Design a protein around this motif. Structure first.
Motif: not given
Ligand SMILES: [Mg+2]
Ligand SMILES: [Mg+2]
Ligand SMILES: [Mg+2]
Ligand SMILES: [Mg+2]
Lengths: 442, 284, 442, 284
Positions: B260, B263, C7, C9
């Motif tokens: 992302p 990160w 992802d 996250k």
DNA sequence: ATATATGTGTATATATACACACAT
DNA sequence: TGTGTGTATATATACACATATATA
């Protein structure tokens, strides 16, 4: 504080000799009848104990090899782990006596995974060929919970293939196919020319040829078009690690070959293309000899058939035919022991069943009245009368729900039908029952 | 010349070769038989990977399974692993409706396959000229229809697919540690070159067909919704599977890891010197 | 090929925040009630399974562990062996729950022998302290065969000293004296100001002092002459290896002291002869401070009481006596639950015994004519649809030694005694039962 | 100065100082707490001992344990051990009711001790002056008593005791291998400085009385005479309680090893590279 | 402003003996 | 002369986590 002068010759006469004999008999050389070194019988005893409740349950190798010290194992449990891991796979087993789930190794990686993972259980082959497990000889030591040696039908020692080293003596027996060992045993049973078993290796597609004692386990190669070859099978001796680095690496960083990997699920597939710097010629014989020599496609093995016989003493055999001929005669005196034990057990069971039927048939009618009694007078009255004292424990065993109907019929049926088993055990011989038991191996 | 490296036949050439870093020698025993011999590799690690966040590029190259990985893959710390080409031309593909803006040298996805746009230029398809300055990086990067063509690379394996045990240790301690190590090149997590090979942590035997649950959390969401399950808990990747290994290798379900925007903050909180950020991260 | 997208996250929030709150809950951070980490709980569960047959028998630590895989411990068996070797000691544990046979370690060398030698069994302390196992809560997972947490009478977590580390959270609790923890528990029961337990280290002869909430552990040194000293004790954190080679060999190589070894039965006994290079200021305070600091005879420590409460959630306490006041409050509920369950079970047992006596009296009086009657309709008959209809199978399942007058009265006596026990179980309370159970621990 | 050395505080000084050799670190833990604290050594070996027979001294001092032993006691390979003074006088006495021929400087065992003629000169017992007619030096050399004295010894410890476990492997493979290694200095054997601490292998208790059996053969020779016994087979010295270890060490039953005339011939059969000798020796 | 240690966990490795037939 | 096999003996090493004293 004690001072004793111990001459060194006494040390070598007692301690060294005892250790040498212990390694010879109880460590390395396998049993001729059972087929197990005195660590695999421990492993199988523990695994068959664990399969008391559930037969198909897979138990962790740290649970099978672990906790064998209560069975009499005097050594570390890691040795039991590595010994029970090597007998559960199929890359080196012609007749596995343990069926396991997990990474037990393959021919490319002849090393089982760590014992934290892999599970094992007693295979169906053990239940198919290992009979009379309750009639096996009892060991001298009280701590040796497993018997002296199990009682298989065919000699398992020739099936899986063994290799053991001890001080003074060493043993090496090549694997033999089950369908040939069974034929040899069947021929020896009736009394005939015992056809020698054929040596067969597990998961191996080659050609095992014997000239005189020596064996010539071979491989296979195939010229693709003119220079490219496909090694479809390497000898049984070789891993994948010690064949890339042993024959394939010291043939590439020398200016001879360029090899690639095609070791598919069939087996070993080391495709090899030769460069210009090679001495291969148009002659087929010289080319074949050079290819099978340089690439190590021929391995040589000679059996050293050393086994611990039924007497516990070491014995060396010249050929496997003698081993089968002696093993058949040794097992034919245990089939007779099975016959005798079954006769005695069935007689003792029918007597108890008939006593139970008599008690039900004579108490329901109202002859032996148990109303208003105690333990002592009942046990005395039933003991004074005949046919009842020898099974006086039988008074309370049948429980209340046998003093009814649908139970006297059943109780008399057991006594009437146990004579069929007793008569069957009184007519069968060793040869007939052995032949019957040999037809269930498939 | 790594001792335990299982080389691919096409390793070092221009092919979709894959590396298969495990976390033990046991888990890789069945790989050499069931893997594709043209494009598949393998290197067994040794336990938990060293936490390599904040360290300089001289202590990372001191752990055995942090120099071996660096040498096998051909990556070198502190240097760009890839080398992109020019980005002049532009085109449109119009796949499944959405407007995918592509360059003259890209790589599109067709049901999980990688095919170069330059070869696709031979047939007309839907290529429509568009003006410059149409840098819609995230627009075509969500499902990765655009991978900039690599002019030059020192990478032997053009895939670093990580497979470890699906237990907690092999999924929350070796997975993110290796993610943080490979984070030193913020281009692997841009073309889907870092992949997770999903491994069954539980195999149930409902009916006569084996049901696969990849994570313990996923298993504890249909446990009391499944009929007569007799599950097997898989602790080791390659040492509790016999023919499930072949199915999971020949029919894999990869997860390409994408970084992302923030990160660095996530990695620093998870892998950092401050232990108070984790106390405020695990409490929510 | 099933290329998906994940992802970062979503990786560190689902799979990293599942090992973070697994090393905290299902690892380290001992449960406040049970007193064990999960590995210790599994080890003790398997030890209880083995002791079921015989509680005085020593089993190998490779058998006490290893078998915990089927109990729900999927974390490798070497960790279980290493965690069980740290529980059978007397030098490390102020209240051992496992008895050991072999070399489990000493203070001089804080390392047990290999698992191939040492045997472990359940200690008498566990049986005197851990009760109501059959009423312990069950884990959510069906694979977790051991209960959610055992139920001791006293907070064993404050008995031996624990040190746990985990992602985000760590715990450190000093060992406390058993006699003081028991007194604190009794005071919390009766209800009054609770005296905080004192910190006592096993097999340690020194001083432990509370300063500003800290704990300072000082050893004792004496001076036999002007230049001779005797180090009678060293702080608990040290060994023989890490005190000779960290505090003593530095001094010897620096030419200050000359040390002779006396580390025998009376712990550590180093005898130090000083040299002229080492200053020996005559002032008592300065000399004592210099000796204490230079020889490393002072060790300061501070606690971190992080535990897991009854709901499986992390809980951090501040005072030493604030876990007893919560452990007692929670355990009173599990004592009341035991009382209720015992009431129900005793009532059921008395009812079954009374029905058994009544059915025997009826059957010996001819009311139930078992003879000349099939079993199924006998079950359907007056044995069912009567007062004893609830247990008809049990009465049908009675055996013969009950129609006799010897045991017909025995059945009635047992029926009358079970009701007497039920009378006990209804005329009792939680406080009385818990304070009676606490009296067993001397 | 090795790492795993429990050196005695009177090592490099003249005293009855002993070195204790175990086969593992697990057999040493209870020795450090039951030692004499002035006269006792210790160094844990590692498994089986490398076959010493037929090895050149250079290859002899390549196994870590053999080199460590050579560096611990102060022995040197190739150079003979402690030297001896001049002899020729005779001072035969009547100790223990026998004519024992003793030189002017020896060591005499009264009862499990070591006293020398020089210190015996001041205790006022019988001295008989004997000329040098007798030559039977072996008449007193075969027994432990009346051994040659020492004028200069480079040996740190004055005694070497091999304390291995009394299982089959300990007495059969490791003990008569350290014996073969120490046979490089037969002067050690002549002076009775190579001892074996008799450790139990089976400590079986009947009622409340314990029975120590040092070999399996002794147990099997008395198995059918003791009452109902619960055998406790102690596999190694690390499986012994501290009371039994303390009784073993502080009340030791030594076994001083003395070599015969043909010790080389009876070592070549057990340690040489000829398995036919073992075949012939075992079949008897 | 770093170093150390404490206890569950992730993987792994090494030296040594014994013998007997192939490969040098 | 040299690896090599399988059951035995004994042992060792890297990495993660946190926090409160010793050290710099
Ligand atoms: Mg693994
Ligand atoms: Mg794992
Ligand atoms: Mg030993
Ligand atoms: Mg030992």
């Amino acid at each position: 504080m004690q001072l004793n002068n111990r001459d060194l010759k006494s040390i070598i006469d007692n301690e060294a000799l005892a250790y040498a004999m212990y390694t010879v008999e109880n460590r390395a050389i396998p049993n001729m009848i059972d087929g197990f070194k005195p660590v695999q019988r421990f492993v199988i005893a523990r695994a068959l104990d664990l399969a008391r409740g559930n037969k198909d349950k897979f138990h962790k190798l740290a649970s099978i090899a672990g906790g064998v010290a209560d069975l009499g194992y005097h050594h570390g449990e890691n040795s039991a782990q590595d010994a029970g891991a090597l007998m559960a796979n199929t890359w080196n087993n012609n007749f596995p006596l343990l069926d396991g789930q997990g990474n037990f190794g393959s021919r490319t990686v002849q090393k089982a995974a760590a014992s934290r993972y892999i599970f094992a259980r007693v295979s169906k082959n053990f239940y198919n060929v290992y009979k009379d497990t309750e009639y096996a000889p009892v060991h001298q030591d009280k701590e040796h919970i497993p018997p002296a040696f199990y009682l298989p039908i065919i000699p398992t020692v020739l099936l899986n293939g063994v290799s053991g080293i001890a001080t003074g003596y060493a043993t090496y027996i090549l694997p033999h196919s089950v369908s040939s060992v069974k034929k040899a045993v069947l021929q020896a049973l009736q009394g005939k020319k015992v056809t020698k078993p054929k040596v067969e290796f597990p998961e191996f597609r080659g050609e095992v040829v014997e000239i005189d004692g020596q064996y010539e386990i071979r491989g296979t190669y195939k010229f693709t078009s003119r220079t490219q070859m496909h090694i479809t099978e390497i000898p049984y001796k070789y891993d994948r690690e010690t064949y890339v680095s042993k024959i394939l690496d010291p043939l590439e960083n020398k200016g001879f070959i360029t090899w690639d990997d095609a070791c598919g699920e069939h087996g070993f597939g080391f495709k090899v293309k030769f460069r210009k710097e090679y001495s291969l010629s148009d002659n087929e014989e010289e080319r074949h000899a050079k290819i099978m020599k340089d690439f190590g496609l021929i391995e040589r093995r000679s059996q050293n058939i050393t086994v611990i016989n039924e007497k516990g003493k070491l014995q060396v055999y010249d050929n496997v035919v003698d081993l089968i001929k002696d093993f058949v005669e040794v097992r034919k005196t245990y089939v007779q022991k099975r016959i005798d034990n079954k006769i005695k057990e069935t007689e003792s069971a029918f007597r108890l069943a008939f006593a139970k039927a008599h008690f039900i048939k004579k108490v329901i009618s109202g002859e032996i009245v148990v109303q208003g009694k105690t333990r002592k007078e009942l046990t005395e009255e039933l003991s004074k009368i005949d046919m009842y004292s020898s099974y006086v424990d039988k008074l309370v065993g049948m429980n209340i729900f046998h003093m009814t109907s649908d139970e006297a019929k059943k109780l008399a049926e057991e006594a009437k039908a146990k004579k069929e088993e007793n008569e069957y055990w009184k007519t069968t011989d060793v040869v007939t029952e052995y032949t019957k038991d040999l037809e269930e191996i498939k | 010349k790594v001792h335990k490296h299982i080389k691919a036949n096409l390793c070092g050439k221009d092919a979709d070769t894959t590396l298969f870093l495990t976390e033990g020698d046991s888990a890789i025993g069945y790989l050499i038989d069931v893997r594709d011999k043209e494009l598949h590799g393998g290197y067994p690690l040794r336990g938990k990977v060293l936490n390599s966040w904040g360290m300089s590029y001289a202590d990372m190259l001191k752990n055995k399974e942090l120099f071996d990985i660096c040498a096998i893959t051909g990556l070198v710390l502190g240097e760009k692993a890839f080398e992109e080409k020019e980005d002049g031309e532009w085109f449109t593909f119009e796949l499944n409706g959405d407007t995918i803006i592509v360059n003259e040298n890209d790589e599109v996805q067709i049901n999980g396959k990688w095919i170069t746009v330059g070869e696709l230029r031979k047939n007309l398809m839907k290529f429509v000229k568009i003006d410059s300055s149409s840098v819609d990086m995230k627009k075509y990067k969500l499902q990765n229809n655009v991978r900039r063509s690599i002019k030059s690379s020192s990478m032997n394996y053009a895939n670093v697919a990580i497979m470890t045990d699906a237990d907690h240790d092999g999924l929350g301690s070796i997975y993110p540690s290796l993610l943080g190590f490979f984070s030193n090149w913020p281009e692997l997590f841009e073309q889907g070159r870092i992949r997770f090979v999903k491994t069954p942590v539980i195999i149930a035997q409902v009916g006569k067909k084996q049901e696969w649950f990849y994570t313990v959390a996923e298993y504890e969401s249909a446990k009391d919704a499944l009929p007569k399950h007799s599950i097997r808990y898989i602790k080791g990747l390659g040492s509790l599977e016999k023919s499930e290994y072949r199915e999971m290798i020949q029919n894999p379900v990869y997860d390409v890891v994408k970084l992302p925007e923030n990160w660095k903050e996530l990695f620093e909180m998870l892998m950092g010197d401050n232990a108070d950020l984790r106390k405020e991260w695990m409490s929510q």
